Symmetry: C2
């Protein structure tokens, strides 16, 4: 099976994990602390904190900004459901805005309109743009719009470690950046994530919330347990020095897809993602024409040893985010991407031959 992802954890990392299990510290220790330093340097950001997963990162960012009951956060329609769920979990309302059909990211003009029209009843406090599939497109615009309207910005950069727009590393534009180390997301720790910020007060607050309010040890506030193990930290920091080369490889494979898929684009059978400068290419998602039954395409591809899937969900389609605004607005772009999107294998373990294999299979399936 040509799989969507297959992260290869360096052998030296596996040996370090074994050493830690045998005779080392299991809870967050030197490996996590070094990983945080190294992430901060990689991103050019003042502070990083590693946490249990990327959902935990978003959760902590919301809590640290005192976003909760009575409040609202704008989210894109097209994303993994965690983005909207976590807003609701803190007691805030997820306010959905449609995405761009090209970038698959929150549409800046529709974002502006939403903010312009907002008059409650909840207090609108933040935007949570998603840099979907590693696409940094609109990062700087989101920052500008947030500043223009007095909003916080939490980047849901789950899929975007190593992406960048116009000199800005994704995750670093505003109050918080949130990353995932899930196995589909290029750098993995099995489960893991990170919160980054340039604001030391926000850093200190997340560090308290991550571990029971602990600062001898004093308990300064109520908190949670979102600590990452020391051995998970060891895995992550072993992979980080490889990430740029993995992204470069992914960009080369994306160009191969672009070249080889052109015949299908020309006859209107699918559209391609736009793998802009700075895209980290965590996912390569095409969009099938409406006349294809996507579930049947996925099944046929599986039978030809190609793993494929939808790329993400449409929040407005799920029936979970029922703020009035979301009932009033329409989300054709996110709905199209949710219904017709098709992610194809793209990861650093593949070569050009593997890309051609995938395109051959997809061409065959769409012919029949």
């Amino acid at each position: 099976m040509i799989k969507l992802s297959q992260p290869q954890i360096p052998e030296f990392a596996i040996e370090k994990v074994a050493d830690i299990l045998r005779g080392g510290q299991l809870v967050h220790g030197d490996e996590c602390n070094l990983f945080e330093q190294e992430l901060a340097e990689y991103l050019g950001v003042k502070h990083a904190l590693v946490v249990s997963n990327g959902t935990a990162a978003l959760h902590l960012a919301l809590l640290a900004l005192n976003i909760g009951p009575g409040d609202a956060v704008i989210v894109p329609d097209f994303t993994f459901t965690a983005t909207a769920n976590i807003v609701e979990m803190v007691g805030a309302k997820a306010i959905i805005v449609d995405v761009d059909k090209t970038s698959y990211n929150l549409d800046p003009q529709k974002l502006q309109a939403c903010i312009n029209e907002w008059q409650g009843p909840e207090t609108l406090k933040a935007i949570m743009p998603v840099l979907e599939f590693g696409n940094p497109t609109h990062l700087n615009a989101y920052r500008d719009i947030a500043k223009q309207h007095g909003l916080f910005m939490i980047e849901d950069a789950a899929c975007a470690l190593g992406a960048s727009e116009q000199g800005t590393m994704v995750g670093t534009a505003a109050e918080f950046g949130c990353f995932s180390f899930h196995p589909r997301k290029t750098l993995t720790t099995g489960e893991g994530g990170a919160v980054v910020t340039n604001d030391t007060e926000l850093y200190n607050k997340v560090a308290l919330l991550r571990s029971h309010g602990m600062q001898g040890v004093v308990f300064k506030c109520v908190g949670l347990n979102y600590r990452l193990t020391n051995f998970q930290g060891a895995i992550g920091r072993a992979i980080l020095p490889e990430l740029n080369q993995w992204i470069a490889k992914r960009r080369e494979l994306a160009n191969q897809y672009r070249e080889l898929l052109a015949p299908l684009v020309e006859v209107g059978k699918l559209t391609l993602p736009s793998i802009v400068e700075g895209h980290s290419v965590q996912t390569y998602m095409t969009v099938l024409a409406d006349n294809f039954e996507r579930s049947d395409v996925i099944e046929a591809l599986r039978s030809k040893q190609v793993e494929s899937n939808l790329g993400a969900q449409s929040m407005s389609s799920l029936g979970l985010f029922n703020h009035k605004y979301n009932t009033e607005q329409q989300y054709p772009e996110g709905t199209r991407l949710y219904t017709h999107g098709l992610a194809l294998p793209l990861h650093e373990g593949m070569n050009a031959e593997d890309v051609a294999t995938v395109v051959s299979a997809l061409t065959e399936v769409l012919e029949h």
Copy 2:
């Protein structure tokens, strides 16, 4: 250093972890699913779900029972701060009740008084007793009290996997049992925990909440979190579980050695001992020093003599975090005494009787000077 704990992960488990990292599934997989089955069978409970840590287990239990803003949960004064924090984090108010001096667990008579006097304004929905340090004492009383008053019961069994009272395995008495696999807590996965229940509806709800509301196409049934445990952490846990009864048995032998060796210090009035009842899993062995000793100086002196020692747990009422009216109107002299004067001594399955003797020798010397 004779340390408070030092869990030995079996080499075969380390090899299995390496195999998973090299060529296996990293996210919750066959190892977690088998661990859940094996935990359920160990406890004699219908359902188990492994989660990121023991705090996550409590969190999911609260959420599954729809405990939140406008609600109240009773917690013991003496516990790790997570017990009370997690109540507050869901928007409920932690209502503190004192522990008893013998067991260090929530005092049933004071619990009854609190419930009887409760008249709001919040809706009192649950008790969250702690089976502190592996002590099952009062488990069945808590069950009976919750049933008498129409309350849910969430056992904070962080430190009590394998403990039992009068035939009831800790974690299995009522709606939910919550366990921690932190490295201090005998069975470890580095970080980890579990939620158990006999109620299939509660199981199904926690499973949704653990993973984004996902139900297997995947459907999103409700808003949720990510509290999944990795498959490799699950592999560690299920490798250790078959050893846990042997480890507890060894810990109860070591406790009996402490009991014998510390009798002179008890008889002369310098400390009091824990009561290691039938069914105690002996996760922690906490003594209480006489008031004339400065406990922080005792810890520092023991450190200089290669003995790790610490306070056992916190007093919630001391922390200034749980400010419901009720908590201001009560004193908590028992939890205060345990917080201020309690001293945990090394007790884990890697020690032998000679090591216990070493610890007692050191403590005797420190308390003489």
